[PDB]
Design a protein around this nucleic acid. Structure first.
Ligand SMILES: [Mg+2]
Lengths: 252, 226, 414, 180, 168, 107, 40
RNA sequence: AAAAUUUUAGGAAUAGUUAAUAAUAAUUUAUAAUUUUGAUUAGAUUGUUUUGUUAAUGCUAUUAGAUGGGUGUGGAAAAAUAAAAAAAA
C-alpha cells in the first residue's frame, strides 16, 4: 500500500523562504549588517589580486526578460556614482544601518553614499555603495583596483550588488571572493627593486638583559557582588571570546 | 560538547559545572545560551522613599480637577528624576545628556574594571523608544585590547549601573560613521607605556591576604576567638 | 459542490454478493450507497431543471436576435457569472461521477456515465457574448477564461462564442486554439501559463500547424496575432524570478517542454534564422525570442533539478498561494519571545499541497523525448548529455524495481 | 520535564539518564539487610522488566567472625570479616569504555577493594583541605618539570597500547627462513 | 537513506564501469613578473569519456576548473588553431592524451554558471551534496571525525553472577 | 525465473526481471482492467486539475485543512502501529467506537 | 546542591525568592580554592 | 517490524472493511477481506517453566504492576495518591 512505502522519519519541511522570521528585509539594518563584511573582504581581495570580472566599462546590459533571472548575485564596480535606470532610489540615512559600514569606511575606503534601488516590479534590489578617496590599504600594480582612477590614485567609485528582496541571508552571502592573497608591503623594504636594502641590519642575537619586567601593580580584589564562577557557568573568559575551561581575566 | 569543563570528567555531577556547554543545550531554547548576566532584581528595585511624600499625576488623566500646584509639579518632577536613577544611571540616561548622543564614547559596567576584568563598549548607534530610558544600543566591544569587527547589541543596556567618561575627541557627528576602536595588539603596535595587559590567558591573580586569613579562620586553622 | 467536496474516506464501493436483491446493508448505507444515490439524484435533478437553469437560446434572424436580447434584458434571472459557476460545478460532478455498476443496480447501466453539456455551454457562451466584457485581465478572470476554454474543448463546442461575433466575421472561422492564443490574457503565474499552454495544445487535435505557426518557409513573421499571443503567454511576471518552476511537477514540466517543442517545430525556420545573433529590427520579435529562450532555459533547469536532486528540499513543489498554518499561528499569538514559535513540529511539516517530487517512468520517457525534440534536427542525441542521463535514470530505476515501463514508454523510447 | 514532578526522588536530567553504579538495597529489616552493587540508569527503570544493565556484586554490611582462623595465621587474622563480591572485568568495562557514573558508597567499597583511590567524601578531621598558591605551585613546577618526550611516552603507555614490541620481538617476528 | 541497495556486494558491477581518457586543457594566462605581464600556460586535467563530444568536454572543463580565473569567461576549444566542432566526438577528431587542446576565450562574453548537474553524478545516482572535490581527485578510506564509536550496552541473556547457560 | 537469489534476497520476480524473462499467468478481464485503469484515472485527475482551477484548489485546500486539523497528526507509536484496532483492542468500545471489530485480516 | 550563604546578595522582592545567586568576591575566591582541591 | 502458544455446558456470521495505486491528504480499479481448522459481539481473566501436591510431561496458583481530546511542550507523555529514592560547591 501507500502507507508502508516509507516510515514517517524526516518529513518534507517548508523552506525558509516562506517563513517570515527566517528571511531578511532590506529596510532593516540586518541586511547591511550581512552585506558589509562581504563588501570589505571583496575590496581587500581586489586591492591585492586581479579579479577577472569585478570591474566593468559600463553597467551589465541584458534584455529585460532575462534581467530578473540573471542580475541577482551580480556584483561589480564602476567609476563615478551613476545609477541604473528603472530603479527607484532610496538613500540610507539610518545610523543603525550605516554603523555596519564603519569599519569598511575607516580601514578600507571612506564610504560616501549608501543607496538601495528598488525596481518597478519590486523583485530585484540593487545596493550601491559609493566610496570617496583613495584606498587606505596599499594597492599592488597588478591588483584589479589599480585600474580605477578613484581607487588607486572626482575620486569616487561605486560598487553595485544585485540581490532579491525577501530571501534568507544565504542568498546575500558571497563566498567566491573569500580568497586570501598576501600583502607584500612589509616585505617591500628588502626587495631587490627597493633602494632600502642596505639600511636595515639583522639582529641575530637577543640583547643581554640586566633587569626583569616591571612588576604589575598590586592586585585589588573586586568589591561588587559577582555572578559566580564563570567557568562553572560556561561563560567564555569575558563573555566575549576564548574557552570556558581556560578561564582568564574575569575578576581574578 | 564544544567547551567542556576539565575535559570529560564525570567524577561527580558538580564537576561538570553549572552548565555543560556555552551554546544552548536544546535547539528550541536559544535563550539558554551562556552569557554574563546582571542582578536585575536589585538594579530594578528602585527606592520608593523618594516617591513617598510627593504627589503624583497619572499620564492618562489631563482633567482640570486632577491638576496640582506648579510647585508640587516641580517637586514631583525632581522626585521622579531621583527615583529613576536611585539604583544607578542607565546607558540611555547617560547618552541623552551627551553631545552627539554619546556616539564614539566608552561605556562600562561597575564590575567590568575591578579585578582582572577590563572591558568596555564603544558606542556606535542608539535607537530610543518613546520611553527614552529604554531602547536598543549597538556598539563595539573591547576586551583586554581586542576589539570586535562589527557593532553588536549591548546586553542588559536598559538595566542601570553604567558609567561613561565623555571625551570630546571621541565624539562622532551623526553625519559620519563611528570608527571601530583599533585593536591594541593587532591594529596599532603593542606599547607597554600606553596600555598594559592586566591578565594574560594563563594569568591567575595572587591570593589576597584578607581572603586567605578568612578562609583559614573558617576552616579552623588560625585560632579565631570571640 | 457538496458532492464534489464530499469526504470519501471510508467509501469502499465494491461488488458484494449478498446484496443482489437489496441495496447495501443498513450499517453500510453511508459507506457504499450514499455517494451513488447522491450522484443519481444529481443526474435526475439536472435532467429536470436544465432547461430552467440554462434556458434555450434562439438567435433566429437579426430581428429574432434583437427580440431575444430584449427578452433577456427584461428577464435577466441569472447572470453569466453564476450560470458559469453552476456549469463548472456540474462539469466537475460529471467528470467525478460514479463509474462502477453493480448487479443490484436496478437502473440502466448507461446512467453511470458523464453528462453531455453542449447546450448549456452554448447558452452560457450566448450570455457571455451578450454581456459587454465577460473576461478581465485579473487572475480570477484568467481562471474563468481557462475554465470556459476547458468547457468548450471538453464538449466540442467551438470557441469564440463567448466573444463578440464581429471578430469571427473578420477571421471567417477561428479554431479553439486560435481563439485561445488570440484572446488569452497574460498570466501572472507559471501554473496559469501551463494551463493556458495545455489548452492551446488540446484545442487543435491535429491542426497544431495552424494555431502556433506564425512563420513562413524563410523565417518571416507572417501572423503577428499569434506572435503577440505567445509573447503574452510566456510573460515575465510568470517566468521571471528564475524560480518560476519551483512549484512545477513532472506533468506540468512535460506540458511546458511539449509546448516549447511544438513552437520550435512549427517555426523551425524562424528560430534557426534568428538564433544566430541576427537582429530582427522588431522589438516584438526580439521580446518573443528572449521570452522563448528564458522559458526553454528555465524548463531545462527544472528538468535537471528534478533528475539530479530527487525528493530533495530543492526539488519540492507546493500549491500556488498555498496556506501555511504556521505563519498564521505565529501571527495570531502572544509574541512575548520571538524564538518561542508555537506548534513548531506540526507546522514545519504542515503545508498545502507540499510534497516531494521525482521523475517517474512516463514522465522521464516523455521528458527525454521532448528534450531530444528541443534540439536541432542534426543535433546528436547521443551527444546530448541530459537525454543520456534520463535514459540511464530510467534503466537504473527499472533495474532497482522502483518503477516499471509500460508499452507507451517502450514506444516512446524505441 | 513533568507537570507535577516526583518531589521525593528527583534527578538532574531526563530518563533514562547516564549509567550509574550504586548499591541497590532490599526492603527487609536491618537484621537481614544486604546491598547489590549494580549499574543502572540515572532514573530507576522499575517500570519495565529490565531494571539493571549489569550485576557487579553483592555486599554484606554485617561483619562475620573469621571462619578461617585455624588456617595459616597472619596479622589481624581474627578480626571480623565483611564479605563482598565484585566483578572486575565488567566494572572496568563500564568504568572505562562506557564511562558510567559512580555513587559514594560503591566508591568507598572499591577503595577498600583497591580498584579506586579513597573517595572524595572519605575525609578526616585531622587535617583541613589544602590551600593553593599560584606562585608556589609555579615554583614547584619549574623546579620539577618533566621532559616532553618522557611525559609523552608515559601517557602513551598509560592510555594507548602498553603492549609495545621491542627490537627483539620485531626481529623474531620478521621471517628469516626462505620466504614462501 | 534509500540508496537503491539493500544487500551487500563487494564486487563492482558492470554498469558502474566507465571508459575514461585523461585529457588536458591549456589556457593562456598572464602573471605579473617584476617587469610586467608575461604569458604562461595553465593546464587543467579532466577525465573525459571516450564517446564524449567537444561540447561535453567543454562542460567537463567548466565543471572541473575549480578556480575563478580559468573558466570565468566564455571560451572554445581548438587544436593547432583549427576550431573543434562542438557537435563532433573525440573519435572523429582522433583526440588522445597526447593531443594538445588549447582554449581561446572571449573577454566580452562572461560564462554564467548554468551548471546544475553535480560533479559526483553517476548512473548509481549516489551523489554526496556539499562536496566540491571531484570523484577522481580524492580516493581513500579517510577516517570519519563527525560520528563516535558505539559499544553494546544492553546485554543479551547474561547480566552477572554465574553464567550458567547464558540464556541465548 | 522460478527461484529466488539467496545471496541478495531477490525474489523470483526480481530474478526474472534481471534475466529479462516473463512469468505472467494469463490475466482475466478484471485483472486487465485493474492493471489498465490506473493510467486512465491519472489522466482524468490531471485533466481535471488543469481544466478547473478553482474547484481543484478548493478541494485541495479542504483536504489539507482536514488533514492538518486531524486529532492524530503526530506520528507516535499509536499512529505508527500498522493495525490500530487489533493492537489497541483494549480501547475499542469503552473509549473508541470507530471500529466495531478488533480483527479485519489474517493476523 | 548549590549553597546559598546568608551574606549573598539579598533580593528585596516580595514576589519571589529572598536571596540571589550573586556572591561576594570572597565567596568566588573561596569557591575556586575548593574547585582546585576537587580537581586533584 | 515478524513466527508459535490464547478462556466460556446448551457454537454463527463479522465489517469506516482486503489488495493494487503516478493517489503524502486514494472522487479510481478488483470475481476484495474475516470465519465451523471455531471468527465478530458478550462473559471471565494482567500473557510465557516462579505456588501447592504427587511415583508422575498430571492436577492447582501468580499485582512481570505495561497506551489516542488535560497543556503539541519535550530527545522520548507516562505528566496532577503514595511506594524507601541524592537531584548540577
Ligand atoms: Mg478463540
Amino acid at each position: 500500500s501507500r502507507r508502508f512505502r516509507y516510515n514517517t522519519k524526516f518529513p518534507a519541511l517548508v523552506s525558509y523562504n516562506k517563513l517570515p522570521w527566517e528571511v531578511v528585509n532590506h529596510e532593516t539594518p540586518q541586511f547591511h549588517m550581512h552585506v558589509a563584511p562581504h563588501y570589505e573582504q571583496l575590496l581587500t581581495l581586489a586591492a591585492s589580486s586581479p579579479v577577472p570580472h569585478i570591474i566593468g566599462s559600463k553597467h551589465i546590459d541584458v534584455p529585460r526578460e532575462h534581467r530578473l533571472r540573471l542580475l541577482p548575485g551580480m556584483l561589480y564596480l564602476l567609476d563615478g556614482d551613476t545609477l541604473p535606470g528603472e530603479f527607484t532610489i532610496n538613500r540610507v540615512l539610518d545610523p543603525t544601518a550605516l554603523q555596519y559600514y564603519g569599519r569598511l569606511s575607516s580601514q578600507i575606503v571612506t564610504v560616501e553614499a549608501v543607496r538601495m534601488l528598488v525596481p518597478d516590479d519590486l523583485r530585484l534590489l540593487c545596493n550601491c555603495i559609493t566610496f570617496k578617496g583613495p584606498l587606505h590599504l596599499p594597492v599592488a600594480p597588478y591588483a584589479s583596483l589599480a585600474s580605477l582612477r578613484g581607487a588607486s590614485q572626482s575620486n569616487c567609485f561605486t560598487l553595485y550588488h544585485f540581490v532579491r528582496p525577501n530571501r534568507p541571508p544565504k542568498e546575500l552571502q558571497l563566498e567566491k571572493y573569500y580568497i586570501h592573497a598576501p600583502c607584500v608591503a612589509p616585505l617591500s623594504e628588502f626587495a631587490s627593486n627597493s633602494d632600502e636594502r642596505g639600511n636595515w641590519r639583522p639582529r641575530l642575537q637577543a640583547p643581554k638583559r640586566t633587569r626583569r619586567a616591571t612588576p604589575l601593580p598590586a592586585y585589588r580584589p573586586p568589591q561588587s557582588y559577582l555572578m559566580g564562577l564563570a567557568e562553572r557557568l560556561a561563560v567564555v573568559p569575558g563573555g566575549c571570546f576564548g574557552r570556558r575551561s581556560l578561564m582568564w581575566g574575569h575578576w581574578f | 560538547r564544544a567547551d567542556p569543563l576539565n575535559g570529560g570528567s564525570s567524577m561527580t555531577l558538580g564537576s561538570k559545572g553549572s552548565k555543560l556547554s556555552p551554546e544552548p543545550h536544546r535547539r528550541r531554547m536559544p535563550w539558554t545560551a551562556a552569557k554574563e548576566y546582571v542582578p536585575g532584581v536589585v538594579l530594578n528595585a528602585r527606592d520608593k522613599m523618594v516617591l513617598d511624600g510627593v504627589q503624583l499625576l497619572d499620564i492618562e488623566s489631563i482633567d482640570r480637577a486632577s491638576q496640582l500646584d506648579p510647585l508640587e509639579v516641580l517637586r514631583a518632577v525632581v522626585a521622579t528624576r531621583e527615583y529613576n536613577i536611585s539604583t544607578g544611571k542607565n546607558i540611555f540616561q547617560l547618552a541623552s545628556q551627551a553631545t552627539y548622543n554619546g556616539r564614539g564614547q566608552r561605556f562600562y559596567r561597575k564590575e567590568w574594571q575591578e579585578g582582572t576584568y577590563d572591558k568596555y563598549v564603544t558606542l556606535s548607534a542608539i535607537d530610543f523608544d518613546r520611553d527614552g530610558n529604554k531602547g536598543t544600543a549597538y556598539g563595539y566591544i573591547t576586551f583586554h585590547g581586542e576589539t570586535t569587527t562589527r557593532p553588536v547589541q549591548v546586553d542588559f543596556a536598559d538595566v542601570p549601573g553604567w558609567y561613561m567618561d565623555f571625551v570630546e575627541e571621541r565624539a562622532v557627528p551623526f553625519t559620519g560613521i563611528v570608527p571601530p576602536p583599533p585593536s591594541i595588539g593587532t591594529d596599532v603596535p603593542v606599547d607597554p607605556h600606553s596600555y598594559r595587559l592586566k591578565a594574560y590567558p594563563y594569568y591567575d591573580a595572587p591570593n589576597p591576604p584578607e581572603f586567605v586569613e578568612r578562609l583559614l579562620k573558617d576552616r579552623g586553622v588560625l585560632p579565631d576567638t570571640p | 459542490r457538496e458532492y464534489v467536496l464530499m469526504d470519501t474516506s471510508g467509501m469502499k464501493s465494491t461488488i458484494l454478493s449478498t446484496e443482489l436483491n437489496a441495496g447495501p446493508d443498513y450499517e453500510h448505507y453511508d459507506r457504499r450507497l450514499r455517494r451513488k444515490r447522491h450522484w443519481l439524484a444529481i443526474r435526475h435533478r439536472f435532467e429536470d431543471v436544465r432547461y430552467v437553469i440554462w434556458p434555450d437560446v434562439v438567435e433566429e434572424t437579426a430581428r429574432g436576435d434583437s427580440a431575444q436580447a430584449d427578452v433577456s434584458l427584461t428577464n435577466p434571472s441569472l447572470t453569466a457569472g453564476e450560470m458559469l459557476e453552476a456549469l463548472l460545478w456540474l462539469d466537475a460532478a460529471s467528470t467525478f461521477c460514479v463509474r462502477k455498476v453493480h448487479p443490484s443496480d436496478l437502473g440502466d447501466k448507461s446512467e453511470f456515465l458523464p453528462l453531455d453539456l453542449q447546450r448549456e455551454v452554448e447558452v452560457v457562451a450566448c450570455h457571455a457574448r451578450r454581456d459587454l466584457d465577460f473576461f478581465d485581465p485579473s487572475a480570477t478572470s484568467l481562471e474563468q477564461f481557462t475554465a470556459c476554454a476547458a468547457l468548450c474543448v471538453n464538449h466540442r463546442v467551438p470557441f469564440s462564442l463567448f466573444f463578440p461575433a464581429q471578430d469571427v466575421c473578420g477571421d471567417a472561422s477561428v479554431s479553439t486554439g486560435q481563439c485561445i492564443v488570440a484572446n488569452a490574457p497574460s498570466p501572472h503565474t507559471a501554473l496559469g501559463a501551463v494551463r493556458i499552454m495545455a489548452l492551446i495544445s488540446e484545442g487543435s487535435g491535429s491542426d497544431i500547424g495552424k494555431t502556433i505557426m506564425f512563420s513562413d518557409a524563410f523565417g518571416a513573421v507572417t501572423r503577428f496575432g499569434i506572435l503577440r499571443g505567445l509573447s503574452r503567454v510566456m510573460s515575465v511576471e510568470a517566468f521571471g524570478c528564475k524560480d518560476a518552476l519551483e512549484n512545477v511537477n513532472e506533468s506540468e514540466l512535460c506540458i511546458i517542454l511539449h509546448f516549447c517543442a511544438e513552437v520550435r517545430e512549427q517555426n523551425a525556420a524562424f528560430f534557426r534564422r534568428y538564433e544566430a545573433s541576427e537582429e530582427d529590427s522588431d522589438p516584438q520579435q526580439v521580446s518573443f525570442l528572449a521570452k522563448y529562450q528564458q522559458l526553454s532555459q528555465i524548463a531545462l533547469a527544472r528538468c535537471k533539478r528534478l533528475l539530479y536532486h530527487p525528493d530533495s528540499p530543492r526539488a519540492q513543489v507546493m500549491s500556488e498561494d498555498g496556506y501555511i498554518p504556521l505563519v498564521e499561528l505565529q501571527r495570531h499569538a502572544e509574541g512575548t519571545n520571538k524564538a518561542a514559535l508555537i506548534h513548531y513540529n506540526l507546522g514545519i511539516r504542515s503545508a498545502q499541497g507540499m510534497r516531494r517530487v521525482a521523475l517517474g517512468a512516463q514522465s522521464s520517457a516523455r521528458l527525454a523525448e521532448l528534450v531530444s525534440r528541443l534540439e536541432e534536427a542534426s543535433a546528436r542525441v547521443s551527444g546530448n548529455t541530459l537525454v543520456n542521463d534520463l535514459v540511464h535514470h530510467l534503466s537504473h530505476k527499472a533495474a532497482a524495481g522502483k518503477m516499471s515501463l509500460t508499452l507507451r514508454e517502450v514506444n516512446t523510447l524505441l | 520535564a513533568r507537570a507535577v514532578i516526583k518531589r521525593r526522588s528527583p534527578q538532574l536530567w531526563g530518563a533514562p539518564g547516564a549509567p550509574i553504579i550504586r548499591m541497590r538495597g532490599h526492603h527487609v529489616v536491618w537484621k537481614f539487610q544486604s546491598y547489590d552493587l549494580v549499574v543502572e540508569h540515572t532514573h530507576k527503570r522499575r517500570n519495565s522488566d529490565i531494571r539493571l544493565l549489569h550485576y557487579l556484586g553483592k555486599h554484606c554490611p554485617h561483619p562475620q567472625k573469621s571462619l578461617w582462623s585455624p588456617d595459616t595465621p597472619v596479622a589481624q587474622d581474627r578480626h571480623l570479616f565483611m564479605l563482598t563480591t565484585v566483578d572486575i572485568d565488567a566494572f572496568k568495562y563500564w568504568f572505562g569504555v562506557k564511562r558510567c557514573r559512580l555513587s559514594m558508597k560503591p566508591w568507598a567499597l572499591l577503595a577498600k577493594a583497591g580498584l579506586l583511590p579513597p573517595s572524595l567524601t572519605q575525609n578526616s578531621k585531622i587535617m583541613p583541605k589544602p590551600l593553593f598558591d599560584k606562585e608556589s605551585l609555579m615554583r614547584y613546577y619549574l623546579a620539577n618539570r618533566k621532559d616532553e618526550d618522557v611525559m609523552a611516552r608515559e601517557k602513551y603507555l598509560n592510555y594507548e597500547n602498553s603492549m609495545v614490541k621491542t627490537e627483539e620481538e620485531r626481529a623474531a617476528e620478521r621471517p628469516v627462513a626462505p620466504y614462501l | 537513506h534509500d540508496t537503491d541497495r539493500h544487500y551487500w556486494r563487494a564486487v563492482t558491477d558492470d554498469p558502474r564501469v566507465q571508459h575514461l581518457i585523461p585529457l588536458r586543457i591549456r589556457f593562456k594566462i598572464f602573471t605579473w613578473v617584476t617587469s610586467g605581464w608575461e604569458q604562461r600556460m595553465q593546464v587543467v586535467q579532466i577525465m573525459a569519456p571516450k564517446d564524449s563530444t567537444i561540447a561535453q568536454v567543454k562542460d567537463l572543463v567548466i565543471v572541473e576548473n575549480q578556480s575563478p580565473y580559468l573558466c570565468v569567461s566564455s571560451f572554445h576549444l581548438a587544436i593547432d588553431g583549427k576550431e573543434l566542432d562542438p557537435q563532433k566526438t573525440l573519435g572523429e577528431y582522433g583526440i588522445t592524451e597526447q593531443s594538445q587542446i588549447d582554449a581561446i576565450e572571449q573577454n566580452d562574453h562572461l560564462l554564467h554558471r548554468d551548471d546544475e548537474r553535480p560533479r559526483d553524478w553517476t548512473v548509481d545516482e549516489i551523489t554526496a551534496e556539499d562536496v566540491k572535490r571531484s570523484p577522481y581527485k580524492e580516493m581513500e578510506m579517510q577516517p570519519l571525525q563527525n560520528l563516535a564509536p558505539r559499544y553494546e550496552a544492553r546485554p543479551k541473556g547474561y547480566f552477572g553472577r554465574t553464567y550458567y547457560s547464558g540464556m541465548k | 525465473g522460478l527461484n529466488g537469489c539467496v545471496e541478495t534476497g531477490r525474489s523470483r520476480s526480481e530474478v526474472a526481471r534481471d534475466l529479462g524473462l516473463s512469468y505472467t499467468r494469463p490475466l482475466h478481464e478484471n485483472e486487465k482492467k485493474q492493471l489498465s485503469h490506473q493510467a486512465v484515472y491519472y489522466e482524468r485527475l490531471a485533466k481535471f486539475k488543469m481544466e478547473q482551477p478553482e474547484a481543484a484548489r478548493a478541494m485541495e485546500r479542504e483536504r489539507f485543512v482536514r488533514k492538518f486539523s486531524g486529532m492524530f497528526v503526530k506520528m507516535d507509536i499509536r499512529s505508527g502501529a500498522p493495525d490500530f484496532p487489533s493492537t489497541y483492542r483494549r480501547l475499542l468500545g469503552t473509549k473508541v467506537v470507530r471500529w466495531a471489530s478488533k480483527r479485519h485480516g489474517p493476523n | 546542591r548549590q549553597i546559598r550563604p546568608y551574606y549573598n546578595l539579598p533580593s528585596k522582592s516580595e514576589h519571589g525568592r529572598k536571596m540571589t545567586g550573586f556572591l561576594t568576591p570572597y565567596r568566588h575566591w573561596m569557591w575556586k580554592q575548593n574547585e582546585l582541591w576537587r580537581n586533584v
